[PDB]
Amino acid sequence: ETFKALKEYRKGQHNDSYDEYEVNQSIYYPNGGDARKFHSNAKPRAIQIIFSPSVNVRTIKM
Amino acid sequence: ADVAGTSNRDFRGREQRLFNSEQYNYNSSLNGEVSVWVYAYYSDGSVLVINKNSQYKVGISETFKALKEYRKGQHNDSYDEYEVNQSIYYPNGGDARKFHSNAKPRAIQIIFSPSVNVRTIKMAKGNAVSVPDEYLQRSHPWEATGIKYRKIKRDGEIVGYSHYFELPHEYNSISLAVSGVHKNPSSYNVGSAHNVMDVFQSCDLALRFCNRYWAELELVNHYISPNAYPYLDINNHSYGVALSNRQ
Amino acid sequence: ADVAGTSNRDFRGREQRLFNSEQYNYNSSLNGEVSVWVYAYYSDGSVLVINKNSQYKVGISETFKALKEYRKGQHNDSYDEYEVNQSIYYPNGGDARKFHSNAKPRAIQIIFSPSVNVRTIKMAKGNAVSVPDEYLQRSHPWEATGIKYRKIKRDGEIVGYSHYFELPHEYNSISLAVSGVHKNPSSYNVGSAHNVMDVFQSCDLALRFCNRYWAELELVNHYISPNAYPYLDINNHSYGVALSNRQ
Amino acid sequence: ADVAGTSNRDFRGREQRLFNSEQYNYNSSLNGEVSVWVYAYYSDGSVLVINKNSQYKVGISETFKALKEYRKGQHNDSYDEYEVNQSIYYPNGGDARKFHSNAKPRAIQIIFSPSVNVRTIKMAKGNAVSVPDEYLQRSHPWEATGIKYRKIKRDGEIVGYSHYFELPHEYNSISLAVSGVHKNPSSYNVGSAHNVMDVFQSCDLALRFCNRYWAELELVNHYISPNAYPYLDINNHSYGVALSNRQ
Ligand SMILES: Nc1nc2c(ncn2[C@@H]2O[C@H](COP(=O)(O)OP(=O)(O)OP(=O)(O)O)[C@@H](O)[C@H]2O)c(=O)[nH]1
Ligand SMILES: Nc1nc2c(ncn2[C@@H]2O[C@H](COP(=O)(O)OP(=O)(O)OP(=O)(O)O)[C@@H](O)[C@H]2O)c(=O)[nH]1
Ligand SMILES: Nc1nc2c(ncn2[C@@H]2O[C@H](COP(=O)(O)OP(=O)(O)OP(=O)(O)O)[C@@H](O)[C@H]2O)c(=O)[nH]1
Ligand SMILES: Nc1ncnc2c1ncn2[C@@H]1O[C@H](COP(=O)(O)OP(=O)(O)OP(=O)(O)O)[C@@H](O)[C@H]1O
Ligand SMILES: Nc1ncnc2c1ncn2[C@@H]1O[C@H](COP(=O)(O)OP(=O)(O)OP(=O)(O)O)[C@@H](O)[C@H]1O
Ligand SMILES: Nc1ncnc2c1ncn2[C@@H]1O[C@H](COP(=O)(O)OP(=O)(O)OP(=O)(O)O)[C@@H](O)[C@H]1O
Ligand SMILES: Nc1ccn([C@@H]2O[C@H](COP(=O)(O)OP(=O)(O)OP(=O)(O)O)[C@@H](O)[C@H]2O)c(=O)n1
Ligand SMILES: Nc1ccn([C@@H]2O[C@H](COP(=O)(O)OP(=O)(O)OP(=O)(O)O)[C@@H](O)[C@H]2O)c(=O)n1
Ligand SMILES: Nc1ccn([C@@H]2O[C@H](COP(=O)(O)OP(=O)(O)OP(=O)(O)O)[C@@H](O)[C@H]2O)c(=O)n1
Ligand SMILES: Nc1ccn([C@@H]2O[C@H](COP(=O)(O)OP(=O)(O)OP(=O)(O)O)[C@@H](O)[C@H]2O)c(=O)n1
Ligand SMILES: [Cl-]
Ligand SMILES: [Cl-]
Ligand SMILES: [Cl-]
Ligand SMILES: [Mg+2]
Ligand SMILES: [Mg+2]
Ligand SMILES: [Mg+2]
Ligand SMILES: [Mg+2]
Ligand SMILES: [Mg+2]
Ligand SMILES: [Mg+2]
Ligand SMILES: [Mg+2]
């Protein structure tokens, strides 16, 4: 998944979609955008990766 | 004339030092201001400042709703946040579309000017329905929290006092009121019969300010520094101007 | 040990009774809260509560506009209600599309905590432009209305005081301010020179709350009962908790 | 110590040169990345980049619809562009309000990293319904287009490979897929039984990127240059960093 695709998207609600385009430009390069916020609340705060017990743990790659 | 910076006849130098000292001391006279700031920090990095500047004593009181992030001229999920409030006022009391509102403050900093007497500071940190301690019947209406205030220092001088607490937990939903009294080392009570009507007038003359800044940077650059205000930033860095006996 | 509920050595029982009594009495000490609630009832069945909780004395003051129903996050005919206000401030002064605004309160209940002294209660019920009695020049700024307050009672105990008046007529368009003073049977004046600066601080530390509930049911279930507040409902039913010398 | 830049004991200098050479060579080892970029240029001067970075082999495949300009958070005539697509998929198949959509790419640049083997590059340039050559029945699923790739050069070093074609005609409506294989001068087949499951994993581990930039300038300054990527601009100017045996 891209950085964009991991960002919170609220189906059927407002998502500050223009401002979040600007947010992305400033994340891709420092001072690259014109966003109205320092930190997007759409950015993930954490990530959990889970595998089924049928995985071989030694083959996992990230 | 004597050469600058080599004698006691550098009157320009003496006048500069006096000018700075007079400012520091005027503020701490009974004729001077006392000021309080409440900073609410939001998860998007923005900061609501509420400031009040008055003579004799000063304070700020805000509802849980009024401390919540409000983006002027933008969308604020206003209906959903009404539902959020109902669920904060009572568990499962609302119909919101979110577990945690990003409009809720993540932290609070309270700063007082150096003209406050730290021992007179009082805080009422209530729950979301504005009750200081679980139930009114057993609530002392305030706690004296002066001992938790850290000195904000520049060049060895106390430029202010700061109390900071984070609200990083889901149950940290608060109303908040804070108050302090201007230093008075004299035995002239400003609230004695002679001057009490002047203190009542100070209630009406107190000047208030609030604004939401987009970042701590913007706050430091365009609010704190230009007005020679004290501040303590997230990295424990002190801001302010040292004036007492200094050029 | 002795068997529960058969002797004076049921210390758990004695501690329960003391705990309740201490709460009742703490509230009525000079260290305790005094609280006032104003309920505005609207024709759609919803209720605006404004509450304020403070030491020494407490009160609330609201404009005619501020008492009007406001539905957070929904449509409120906001332009038309601006026109409504102009026609309420002066006859035929506006251009509204309605004879009677459903946002106008149909009734008002004022409740005080049992820590109030009923004889200190004062109300300023003004007209829509905030004049207590027709013209400022002949207005006493308040009426002492304590004699009209009914006792809200539970188990024989006064859990609060209520004054209720309906505004069922077209000309019942009001501004409203109410105030009361915390019980003080001592001859220590809390506003005497010794403690007056603490009362000025109480002005700043007073915690405030407002919210619109959708029904009297919702108010009873999620505002009154959870916080052990007193209330009197439309069927004259008393709500509150009896604490003095009770388990 | 010896003086800088006058002897073989300038270990800082030798380390710098090695560091650069190791980077160039690591990329071209079987452990390194291979990368492809597709740039679609629009008439408003903006540029969609799609990039993919993977081990062993890499490629990108996009529908005609997905190559069309999409302005995030702005109006895109979305209904009318649905109608446009119907008329591109089949002549006179839609009801659009325009002869030529400004959302259609005016040109395409394909760039590969210098770790690609140019002889393994394959392109499927299909029509708007994703058919490589008029009809499926007579379509070879790809063309080997490596011979048309120009070397992007900086300081004598190949920093990448570019294939550019304009789509300046009304009938230049395309779907597009392109692929290349990481250099492998060894006789170890990365797709042989020993390592083939690792290549299947590379399919899942391939990192993808897309974004629309407003101008070629913005692309050069904020996408190409900061990440040390190769590029060829409209004036035939080469961008990239020369690393092999250089400080
Ligand atoms: N006091 C002092 N300041 C120093 C010293 N070394 C560097 N400084 C810097 O110089 C500043 C103070 O300089 P001065 O104001 O001229 O020294 P002072 O102690 O105030 O002496 P007075 O002007 O007589 O009041 C401080 O902010 C320091 O960062 C030092 O050894 N002593
Ligand atoms: N006092 C009293 N309560 C009754 C009686 N019959 C039923 N009750 C119920 O019991 C409750 C009070 O019971 P208790 O608290 O145990 O009686 P009490 O008068 O408080 O006696 P103490 O516990 O010694 O203070 C009331 O709320 C009544 O509804 C009765 O005859 N006398
Ligand atoms: N090689 C070379 N570079 C020149 C010459 N004149 C100017 N330059 C510039 O200098 C740069 C290369 O300088 P160097 O790296 O120090 O020379 P070099 O050929 O790499 O020699 P080595 O450091 O031993 O590898 C090039 O980018 C040129 O633009 C010249 O006559 N020969
Ligand atoms: N290098 C120094 N040596 C001795 N005294 C100094 C020196 N620098 C400053 N001082 C003096 O010591 C006093 C304290 O200055 P200082 O800068 O240490 O305090 P501060 O700014 O409040 O805290 P800090 O700089 O540690 O964040 C001032 O009078 C200052 O002039
Ligand atoms: N059935 C009873 N007989 C005698 N005394 C009672 C009885 N029930 C309650 N009491 C006592 O009489 C006092 C008054 O209780 P009561 O329930 O009548 O008052 P209340 O709740 O304020 O008003 P109400 O129940 O009439 O709405 C309390 O001390 C209570 O314990
Ligand atoms: N003035 C020069 N005379 C001789 N050799 C040079 C000179 N300038 C650079 N070189 C060397 O010749 C090689 C090619 O450098 P050059 O700058 O000509 O290629 P380029 O950057 O890929 O293409 P171009 O500069 O023509 O756009 C490098 O090793 C460089 O160090
Ligand atoms: N940095 C920004 C942010 C927003 N806006 C303007 O404000 C408008 C509304 O904000 P937007 O980001 O589009 O969010 P919403 O419309 O509220 O939500 P959504 O687009 O997801 O429906 C935008 O169209 C844009 O023109 C802007 O000038 N620049
Ligand atoms: N718990 C919720 C949240 C929202 N909505 C509906 O969705 C609409 C849009 O959401 P809202 O909360 O009003 O936010 P915005 O309109 O996007 O932003 P704002 O009101 O601040 O302009 C509301 O009018 C409301 O009718 C709802 O059904 N119940
Ligand atoms: N007496 C009135 C009432 C309304 N209008 C017009 O009708 C519009 C819509 O009515 P309004 O009073 O604004 O209510 P709503 O938009 O429906 O609700 P709200 O403003 O609270 O969102 C207004 O903008 C106003 O221009 C008018 O001409 N004169
Ligand atoms: N060939 C077309 C083009 C548009 N419309 C109508 O015009 C409206 C507005 O145009 P649209 O194509 O939807 O563009 P915008 O709303 O302006 O932009 P966007 O949808 O991207 O926000 C559409 O909803 C559609 O009903 C139409 O009748 N037939
Ligand atoms: Cl003084
Ligand atoms: Cl007491
Ligand atoms: Cl290798
Ligand atoms: Mg210092
Ligand atoms: Mg809304
Ligand atoms: Mg309107
Ligand atoms: Mg009863
Ligand atoms: Mg939008
Ligand atoms: Mg549309
Ligand atoms: Mg060159």
DSSP letter string, A2-46: -HHHHS---TTS---HHHHHHHHHHHHSTT-S--S-SS-TTS-S-
Q: Do A2 and D210 touch (CB under 8 A)?
A: yes
Query: For residue B30, how many other CB atoms are within 10 A of its CB?
Result: 15
- Tokens linked to A19: 């401002």
> What is the sign, positive or negative, of the torsion defined by CA atoms of C171, C172, C174, C180?
positive
DSSP 3-state percent helix, strand, coil across chain C (nearest 5): 25, 30, 45
Which of B195, B245, B239 lies closest to B217 in space, CA to CA?
B239
**Pairing of the two strands C150-154 and C57-62:** unpaired
Q: Which residues contact D141 (CB under 8 A, 6 or more apart)?
A: D124, D132
Q: How far apart (Å, rounded) are the C-alpha atoms in residues B33 and B58?
A: 9
Q: Do B136 and C209 touch (CB under 8 A)?
A: no
Cα–Cα separations (whole angstroms), residue C218 to B108, C76, C214, C222, D237: 32, 22, 7, 6, 71
CA angle C168, C169, C173 (to 5 degrees): 100
Q: What is the 3-state secondary structure (H, E, C) of chain D?
A: CCCCCCCCCCHHHHHHHHHHHHHHHHHHCCCCEEEEEEEEECCCCCEEEEEEEEECEEEEEECHHHHCCCCCCCCCCHHHHHHHHHHHHCCCCCCCCCCCCCCCCCEEEEEECCCECHHHCEEEEECCCCCCCCCHHHCCCCECCHHHCEEEEECCEEEEEEEEEECCCCCCCCEEEEEEEECCCCCCCCCCCCCHHHHHHHHHHCEEEEEEECCHHHHHHHHHCCCCCCEECCCCCEECCCCCCCC
Q: Do D223 and A29 touch (CB under 8 A)?
A: yes
Interface A:B, Cβ pairs < 8 A: 26
Helix, strand or coil for residue C148? helix
Ligand 8, atom nearest to B94 Cα:
1
Query: For residue C206, how many other CB atoms are within 10 A of its CB?
Result: 26
Q: Which residues contact D117 (CB under 8 A, 6 or more apart)?
A: D180, D181, D182, D183, D184
Expressed in angstroms and rounded, the spacing between residue D120 Cα and the centre of ligand 20 is 28
Q: Out of D74, D210, D226, whose CB is closest to A29? A: D226
Q: Which ligand is nearest to the CA of D240?
A: 6
Q: How far apart (Å, rounded) are the C-alpha atoms in residues B229 and B51?
A: 11
Q: What is the 3-state secondary structure (H, E, C) of C54-122?
A: EECEEEEEECHHHHCCCCCCCCCCHHHHHHHHHHHHCCCCCCCCCCCCCCCCCEEEEEECCCECHHHCE
- Tokens linked to C140: 């006493």
Task: Look at ligand 6, atom 11, and give the residue with the nearest C-alpha.
Answer: D155
Which of C64, C62, C101, C57 lies closest to C79 in space, CA to CA?
C101
Q: Which ligand is nearest to the CA of D182?
A: 13
Q: What is the CA radius of gyration of chain A?
A: 16
Residues of A with a Cβ under 8 Å from any B Cβ are: 13-14, 16, 36-41
Which of C52, C225, C70 lies closest to C154 in space, CA to CA?
C225
Residue at D157: amino acid letter:
E
**Pairing of the two strands C231-232 and C33-41:** unpaired
The answer to whether the CB of D11 falls within 8 A of the CB of D245 is no
Q: Do C243 and B137 touch (CB under 8 A)?
A: yes
Residue at A34: amino acid letter:
D
Q: Which ligand is nearest to the CA of C29?
A: 12
Chain D CB contacts of A3 below 8 Å: 209
Breaks in chain D, after residue numbers (C to N greater than 2.5 Å):
none
Q: Distance from first CA to last CA of chain A, Å, rounded?
A: 12
How many whole angstroms from its chain centre is CA C45?
18
Instruction: Give the residue ranges of DSSP H helices in chain B.
Output: 11-28, 64-67, 78-89, 196-205, 216-219
Cα–Cα separations (whole angstroms), residue B117 to A27, B147, B179: 45, 11, 11
For C22, the enclosing helix (H) or strand (E) is helix C11-28
Q: How far apart (Å, rounded) are the C-alpha atoms in residues D27 and B165?
A: 49
How many whole angstroms from its chain centre is CA D117?
14
Q: How far apart (Å, rounded) are the C-alpha atoms in residues B8 and B25?
A: 23
Q: What is the CA radius of gyration of chain C?
A: 21
Q: D154 in ligand 6 pocket by Cβ < 6 Å?
A: yes
Chain D CB contacts of A24 below 8 Å: 211
Long-range contacts of C89-94 (CB under 8 A, 24+ apart): C89/C128, C89/C129
Q: What is the CA radius of gyration of chain B?
A: 21
Distance from CA of C93 to the nearest CA of B (A): 30
Buried b (16+ CB within 10 A) or exposed e, C155-174: eebebbbbbbeebeeeeebb
Cα–Cα separations (whole angstroms), residue D28 to C218, D56, D203, D206: 70, 10, 19, 17
> Resolution in angstroms for this experimental structure?
2.1
Torsion angle (degrees, nearest 10) of CA D135, D137, D142, D145? -70
- Tokens linked to B79: 């209906």
- Please give the DSSP secondary-structure letter assigned to residue B56: S
Q: What is the CA radius of gyration of chain D?
A: 21
Which of B99, B85, B240, B58 lies closest to B162 in space, CA to CA?
B240
- Tokens linked to B43: 């998860």
Q: Which residues of B are annotated as a binding site for ATP?
A: 151, 153, 155-156, 183
Q: Do A21 and D73 touch (CB under 8 A)?
A: yes
The answer to whether the CB of B181 falls within 8 A of the CB of C201 is yes
- Tokens linked to D48: 């969609």
The answer to whether the CB of C5 falls within 8 A of the CB of C29 is no
Which of C88, C47, C82, C65 lies closest to C170 in space, CA to CA?
C88
Report the residue among C68, C69, C75, C80 best suited for mutation to probe ligand 9: largest number of ligand atoms under 8 A from its CB.
C80
Taking each helix axis as running N to C, give the angle between helix C196-205 and helix B196-205, from 0 to 180 degrees, rounded to the nearest 10.
Answer: 10
Expressed in angstroms and rounded, the spacing between residue D199 Cα and the centre of ligand 13 is 14
Q: How far apart (Å, rounded) are the C-alpha atoms in residues D191 and B194?
A: 96
Q: How far apart (Å, rounded) are the C-alpha atoms in residues D60 and B142?
A: 65
Tokens 């009154």 correspond to C224
Q: Do B45 and A36 touch (CB under 8 A)?
A: no
Q: How far apart (Å, rounded) are the C-alpha atoms in residues D43 and B58?
A: 61
- Tokens linked to C167: 């505004």
Breaks in chain A, after residue numbers (C to N greater than 2.5 Å):
none
Q: How far apart (Å, rounded) are the C-alpha atoms in residues D162 and B37?
A: 59
Query: Which chain A residue has its CA at the smallest distance from B102's CA?
Result: A41
The answer to whether the CB of B36 falls within 8 A of the CB of B60 is yes
Residue at D158: amino acid letter:
I
Expressed in angstroms and rounded, the spacing between residue D75 Cα and the centre of ligand 19 is 7
Helix, strand or coil for residue B2? coil
Q: How far apart (Å, rounded) are the C-alpha atoms in residues D14 and C15?
A: 83
Query: For residue D246, how many other CB atoms are within 10 A of its CB?
Result: 15
Q: How far apart (Å, rounded) are the C-alpha atoms in residues C105 and C107?
A: 5
Residue at D126: amino acid letter:
G
Buried b (16+ CB within 10 A) or exposed e, D157-182: bebbbbbbeebeeeeebbbbbbbbbb
The answer to whether the CB of D85 falls within 8 A of the CB of D134 is no
- Tokens linked to D113: 């990293």
Q: How far apart (Å, rounded) are the C-alpha atoms in residues D162 and D238?
A: 10
Q: How far apart (Å, rounded) are the C-alpha atoms in residues C200 and B199?
A: 8
> What is the sign, positive or negative, of the torsion defined by CA atoms of D154, D159, D163, D167?
negative
| Maximum Cα–Cα distance across chain B | 80
Q: How far apart (Å, rounded) are the C-alpha atoms in residues A11 and A6?
A: 14
Task: Look at ligand 4, atom 9, and give the residue with the nearest C-alpha.
Answer: B155
Q: How far apart (Å, rounded) are the C-alpha atoms in residues D228 and D240?
A: 6
